[PDB]
Amino acid sequence: KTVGEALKGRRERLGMTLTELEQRTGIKREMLVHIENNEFDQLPNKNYSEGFIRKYASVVNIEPNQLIQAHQDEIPSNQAEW
Ligand SMILES: [Zn+2]
Numbered sequence: 703k704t705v706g707e708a709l710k711g712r713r714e715r716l717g718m719t720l721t722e723l724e725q726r727t728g729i730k731r732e733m734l735v736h737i738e739n740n741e742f743d744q745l746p747n748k749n750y751s752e753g754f755i756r757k758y759a760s761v762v763n764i765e766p767n768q769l770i771q772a773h774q775d776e777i778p779s780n781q782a783e784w
Contacts, residue, residue: 705755705773710738712762726761729754742778749780 703711713723720731727734733754736744742751752770755777759766770777 704740705769705776706738706740708769708773709755709758709762709764712764713738716762718762723758723761727754727757729757734758740776748778749782751778752780 713720720734723729723734724731733745736742737751737754737758742748745751745754755770756766758764759769
């Protein structure tokens with residue numbers, strides 16, 4: 703599975719709507735759907751990809767670091783170079 707499928711799957715098993723997840727995470731539904739679909743290039747700031755995944759994961763009781771590690775080649779890391 704992709705990271706977005708892992709997250710969405712968990713959300714659906716919890717019976718949690720996107721509306722609820724936006725409330726709990728503070729991440730707008732558009733961006734939550736982009737994450738669920740691995741559409742990281744559609745985030746205004748792609749550097750936030752990991753942080754968005756982390757907040758999602760924490761709300762749905764997925765341990766974030768090991769999720770990120772298992773999917774690291776999918777996830778744009780924070781390009782905080784300069
Ligand atoms: Zn968009």
